[PDB]
Amino acid sequence: MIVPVRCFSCGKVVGDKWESYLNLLQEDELDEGTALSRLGLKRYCCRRMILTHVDLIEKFLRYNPLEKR
């Protein structure tokens, strides 16, 4: 639902690169392959962590809050 904090296989921290990855795709006009390498994700265990992630949090945030303060 949200970007994992650590790579499942080797434990590298990948939860602080989601926004950078999206920025590279949008503003830098880079393909997903080049963006992953620029972020320092070399082992393919880490690449699939960011490459195949589905951000379902955005869909959930569209619903109005159940309890508003």
Partner 1 sequence: KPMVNESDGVTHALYPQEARLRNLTYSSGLFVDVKKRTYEAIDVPGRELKYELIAEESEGKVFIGRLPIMLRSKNCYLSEATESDLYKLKECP
Partner 2 sequence: TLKYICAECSSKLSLSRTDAVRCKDCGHRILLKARTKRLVQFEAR
Residues that bind partner 2 in the complex, under the rule CB under 8 A: 64-68
- Would you report the helix, strand and coil content of the chain in percent, each value rounded to 5? 40, 5, 55
Flag whether 19 is marked binding.
no
For residues 38-67, which are near Zn ion according to CB under 5 A?
43, 45-46
Tokens found for residue 24: 């590279």
Give residue for tokens 């972020």: 39
Q: Is 10 near Zn ion (CB under 5 A)?
A: yes
Closest distance between partner 2 and the C-beta of residue 5, in Å? 11
Flag whether 45 is marked binding.
yes
**Alpha carbons 16 and 36: distance in angstroms, whole number:** 13
Binding positions for Zn(2+) are 7, 10, 45-46
Known binding-site residue numbers? 7, 10, 45-46
